[PDB]
Write a protein that binds this ligand. Structure first.
Ligand code: ZN
Lengths: 150, 208, 261, 206, 124
RNA sequence: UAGCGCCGGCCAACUCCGUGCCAGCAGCCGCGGUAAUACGGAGGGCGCGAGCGUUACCCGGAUUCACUGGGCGUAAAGGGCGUGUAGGCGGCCUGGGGCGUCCCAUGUGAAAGACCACGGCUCAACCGUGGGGGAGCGUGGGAUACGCUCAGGCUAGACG
RNA sequence: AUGCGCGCUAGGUCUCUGGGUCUCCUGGGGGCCGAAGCUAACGCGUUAAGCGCGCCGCCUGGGGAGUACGGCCGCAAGGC
């Protein structure tokens, strides 16, 4: 039912008593292109197991996005660790102006027009988390009105 | 200079029928009905998943190959569409469909865009009662496209417009099948065109 | 591998312990394995040396599956049916075919007059439409006429692209072709029957007269005879060409050749 | 290391002797020689059908050979021709009116020798060792078989240096007597030398 | 820093340093060869690279790299010098344009003729 | 008349022969010691096409001089510490002036170039005819919230 | 290895030194855990490396090098 996307497989190693033990980490985006996005990071000693785990985690940790005309209600600027993401609403017929990682995240959201920029460190995991936070921190006119007026 | 050489190989590479050759690509011979895999020695091997760049490039190449125009002219048209008002995609498609050769093909004078280009270049086509011999000419809503009096009896045009009897033309066009003439009414919509192209990828490609 | 969908195809074939099954181009043996557990006898034609060990290994637990290393075209199918299927009533062909060898592999089987009951295969959706075409659907042509003259065709469903792990360029569809009891229409002049069928659809958007007179030097010489015979058989070269039914072509293949044969 | 034979560890209990008969000191070695010859011949001949077990018993100058095979049709042949010729061969070998028997092993995925010989056959066909082992263990695990383990010796994929692969799944308690562990060995002869395949299967307790 | 600090001092611009001093703001130069010597590459590579010594129209006298399979660079050959640096050879910072003055295009190229300046083989 | 570059990752495009750390390739990471998709040749493919590549230089990516838009415990970075000149900055309440600041009217901001519309070259380049816009500066008028200023007060900073 | 000044942001605990109405309340100083928060991490956390404002001094890859040259100050070694 949910679409799946792949960001990175990385093979990390740790030393043992005369040799190396490997473990694979997988980053996965899961979305329905209607305003639901999940990001999963999964570790396993074997690649398909890692993919499955990441998919599972993504299906758990889901985020709703307030889409209107396939864009973001308001520009945002979120720093996670040493990574920084800048999102800006765009007019229709603009497309997703983003790097590989932000594009991967935002495509499965249903966003069709946006401008983005990465700042500071560009470690993909941190960028992915920062994008997640920026998506999680969005508000509509209605939400803000309810908060203020009630 | 346009592209001269094998054609249905483009059909194969792009993975969509892309009616370029006219009649053959309607018969069981379009080369999509036999060997629909890309050409070459490694045409039928399990390929790695395409990159973002690859996806955008393929989309752009497909859209360009449909109309058979140079990359330079394509980029110029895209720039013009970008600078204009409204949606880039819709305006871009409207600009690609306003070409004289494309309009000629649409109206049914020719079976293919290449034949239409040849007819235009060879002076068999008139616009508002004046000879125009340039495939890249841009027509505007409220223009009269007709076949030159001299060429009204040529076998090609005669049989092409004989086959257009009791056949529908695009909603953004009208045709007087007996009158050897047509009419351009308005810019075609995104919905009007049956293009197998998602122009969003073209926009994204040119953003880089 | 395409999971339970394989078991679906066999389900559309309805084979049992009564039946013997011919496999054309098994590959790994995904379909072959499923067929083996449901069929009394399975025969396979494989010609690729590299995939042979894998296919053999996949067939290790089974015994009622035979593999013959020879191309289908060159080998006499009749003899193979004679030995391999001595003790089964229904003889059926279930296969998935490479893109190049789709139609000719069907035509060889149909021309040979094999005791086959049904051929349930996976082909291109386009080819599936062309084989099973109603009149004047733009799918009507030589393929449809030939197949329906030999075997009744029925497309079951459409297999989407989003099935295979490597996603292909064109969709697939599953068809059934049941061998008719004798020729569909009585005509002794089979060769010229096919000549007429293929000539009549030379130009789809042209008329019958154009597709008739242009073909054949004698035909290009004796124009009037064609017209008068067509009017004799209550047909005319004006309608289209694509609107004719099989029996109409039977009548024409009788009359037109009766004029000169 | 240096694990002892899991069958020899359980000859008394949870397993049984393959050969069951009696002979005095005077006429022991001869019977054993005949028995070994029979086993050799059977291994040589019936390999195609997937032999898993050969049982020999003696009552009074008689031989009751029982062969456990995955595919009994191959052994029997057409109209009982092959079984008959095999019986003729065995009887010609030793004038003891041998009585051949054929049994079909139920669920041939649950016999360790069959698994071992299958893996060896796969290796002979230049397969990928690790993937084959994983698949074999998976197939054993599917149809019950509380424990499974497969070991491939060394000289993997025509390498220069030998190494052990070992894929296993479930409980394989080699230290418990009441285990009922079924064990199977195979030897895979390839162009770059020989390989050893060992399979352990664990079928419940008591 | 504070706005006052920036007003008083400001930000110093960064100037790029030319990697081709000998050229003196020209795409190419003409020189005369003096020494034609084969040298050895930095650690990970081991070969015998052909290198010329060129005195230019400028005051500069620099080592140059001859790209190709074989050359006809003698002790008095007039040559054209081009930008570009060899990663291995420690000191060379220029290439030689093949097929210009005295250097001739490497015999029997078929794939990359623009570089290694050679005429198209008249097919028959 | 159809060429030119590329086909290890950046970056779209894969196999077979020749060589065996040699010949060479190279923008970076690096490929070359007998199974080279990285060198050389073929077949094939990709991109552009009367052009295609290379070198040189400028801006961008460089948030890598950071006004928009960075930092200084250990990554380069707090003066060895005071006193203090110029300079920078600065409580609460009233009133005048209107310098900064803001608004309106107006002169200028030439012509070409830039944007929009319409037209002539058979279209386009190219050109023409109109419409605006424009930082800044002049001149006249207006507003007093904040900053500056002048006058009168207050005690929460400072001092005794 | 932490420039100076001021305002705001849970506490607990141990000390040195004053005031009171004196189980306790209230100031100034010196340590240890730890809210919110900050940090790449270690850690900091009402004595901030937190949240803000003002002013000053510094950094722009690593060697060459705290070198050469020039200048200033010292008897000199040397210092900037
Ligand atoms: Zn085609």
């Amino acid at each position: 039912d949910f679409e799946e996307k792949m960001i990175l497989i990385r093979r990390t190693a740790r030393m043992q008593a005369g040799g190396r033990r490997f473990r694979f980490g997988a980053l996965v985006v899961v979305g329905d292109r209607q305003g639901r996005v999940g990001l999963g990071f999964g570790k396993a000693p074997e690649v398909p197991l890692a993919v499955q785990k990441a998919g599972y985690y993504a299906r758990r940790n889901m985020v709703e996005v307030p889409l209107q005309n396939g864009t973001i209600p308001h520009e945002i600027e979120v720093e996670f660790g040493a990574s920084k993401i800048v999102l800006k609403p765009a007019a229709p017929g603009t497309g997703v102006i983003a790097g590989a990682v932000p594009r991967a995240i935002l495509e499965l959201a249903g966003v069709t027009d946006i401008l983005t920029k990465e700042l500071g460190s560009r470690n993909p995991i941190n960028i992915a988390y920062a994008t997640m936070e920026a998506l999680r921190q969005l508000r509509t006119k209605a939400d803000v009105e309810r908060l203020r007026k009630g | 200079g346009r592209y001269i050489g094998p054609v249905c190989r483009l059909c194969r590479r792009e993975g969509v029928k892309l009616y370029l050759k006219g009649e053959r690509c309607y018969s069981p011979k379009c080369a999509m009905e036999r060997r629909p895999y890309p050409p070459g020695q490694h045409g039928q091997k399990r390929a790695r998943r395409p990159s973002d760049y690859a996806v955008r490039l393929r989309e752009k190449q497909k859209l360009r190959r449909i109309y058979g125009i140079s990359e330079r002219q394509f980029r110029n048209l895209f720039e013009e569409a970008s600078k204009k008002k409204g949606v880039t995609g819709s305006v871009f498609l409207g600009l690609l469909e306003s070409r004289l050769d494309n309009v000629v093909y649409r109206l049914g004078f020719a079976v293919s865009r290449r034949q239409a280009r040849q007819l235009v270049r060879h002076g068999h086509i008139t616009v508002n009662g004046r000879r125009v011999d340039l495939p890249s000419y841009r027509v505007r809503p409220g223009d009269e496209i007709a076949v030159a009096e001299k060429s009204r009896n040529l076998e090609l045009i005669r049989q092409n417009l004989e086959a257009m009897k009791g056949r529908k033309v695009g909603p953004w066009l009208s045709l007087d099948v007996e009158g050897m003439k047509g009419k351009f009414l308005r810019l075609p919509d995104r919905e009007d065109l049956a293009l197998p192209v998602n122009e969003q990828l073209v926009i994204e490609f040119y953003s880089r | 591998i395409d999971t339970n969908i394989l078991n679906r195809i066999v389900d559309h074939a309805e084979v049992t312990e009564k039946t013997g099954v011919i496999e054309i181009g098994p590959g790994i043996g995904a379909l072959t394995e499923q067929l083996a557990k449901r069929a009394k006898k399975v025969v396979a034609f494989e010609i690729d040396q590299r995939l042979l060990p894998i296919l053999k290994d996949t067939l290790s637990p089974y015994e009622n599956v035979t593999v013959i290393h020879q191309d289908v075209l060159k080998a006499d199918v009749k003899s193979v049916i004679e030995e391999q299927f001595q003790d089964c009533d229904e003889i059926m062909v279930v296969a998935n075919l490479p893109y190049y060898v789709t139609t000719p592999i069907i035509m060889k089987l149909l021309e040979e007059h094999l005791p086959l009951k049904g051929i349930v295969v996976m082909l291109q959706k386009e080819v599936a439409e062309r084989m099973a075409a109603d009149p004047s659907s733009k799918e009507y042509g030589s393929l449809s006429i030939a197949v329906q003259f030999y075997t009744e065709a029925k497309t079951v469903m459409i297999v989407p692209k989003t099935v295979f792990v490597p996603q292909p360029n064109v969709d697939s569809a599953v068809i059934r072709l049941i061998l008719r009891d004798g020729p569909a229409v009585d005509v002794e002049n089979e060769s010229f029957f096919f000549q007429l069928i293929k000539a009549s659809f030379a130009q789809r958007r042209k008329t019958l007269l154009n597709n008739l007179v242009n073909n054949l030097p004698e035909g290009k010489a004796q124009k009037s005879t064609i017209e008068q015979v067509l009017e004799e058989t209550n047909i005319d070269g004006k309608r289209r060409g694509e609107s004719l039914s099989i029996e109409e072509f039977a009548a024409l293949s009788n009359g037109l050749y009766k004029a000169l044969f | 290391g240096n694990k002892i034979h899991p069958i020899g560890f359980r000859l008394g209990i949870t397993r049984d002797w393959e050969s069951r008969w009696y002979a005095g000191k005077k006429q022991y070695r001869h019977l054993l020689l005949e028995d070994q010859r029979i086993r050799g011949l059977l291994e040589k001949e019936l390999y195609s059908a997937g032999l898993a077990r050969v049982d020999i018993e003696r009552a009074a100058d008689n031989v009751a050979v029982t062969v456990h095979v995955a595919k009994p049709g191959v052994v029997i042949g057409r109209g009982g021709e092959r079984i008959r010729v095999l019986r003729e061969e065995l009887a010609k070998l030793t004038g003891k009116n041998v009585a051949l028997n054929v049994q079909e092993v139920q669920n041939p995925n649950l016999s360790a020798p069959l698994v071992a010989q299958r893996v060896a056959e796969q290796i002979e066909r230049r397969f990928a060792v690790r993937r084959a082992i994983k698949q074999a263990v998976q197939r054993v695990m599917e149809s019950g078989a509380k424990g499974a383990k497969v070991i491939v010796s060394g000289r993997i994929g025509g390498a220069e240096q030998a190494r052990t692969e070992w894929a296993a799944q479930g409980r394989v308690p080699l230290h418990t007597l009441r285990a009922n562990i079924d064990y199977g060995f195979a030897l895979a002869r390839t162009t770059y030398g020989v390989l050893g395949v060992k399979a352990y299967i664990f079928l419940g307790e008591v | 820093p504070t706005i006052n600090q920036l007003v008083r001092k400001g930000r110093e611009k960064v100037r790029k340093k030319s990697k081709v001093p000998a050229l003196k703001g020209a795409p190419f130069r003409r020189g005369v060869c003096t020494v034609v010597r084969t040298v050895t590459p930095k650690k990970p590579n081991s070969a015998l690279r052909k290198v010329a010594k060129v005195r230019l129209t400028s005051g500069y006298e620099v080592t140059a790299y001859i790209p190709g399979e074989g050359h006809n660079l003698q002790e008095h050959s007039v040559v054209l010098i081009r930008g570009g640096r060899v990663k291995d050879l420690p000191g060379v910072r220029y290439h030689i344009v093949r097929g210009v003055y005295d250097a001739a295009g490497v015999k029997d190229r078929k794939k990359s003729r623009s570089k290694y300046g050679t005429k198209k083989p008249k097919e028959a």
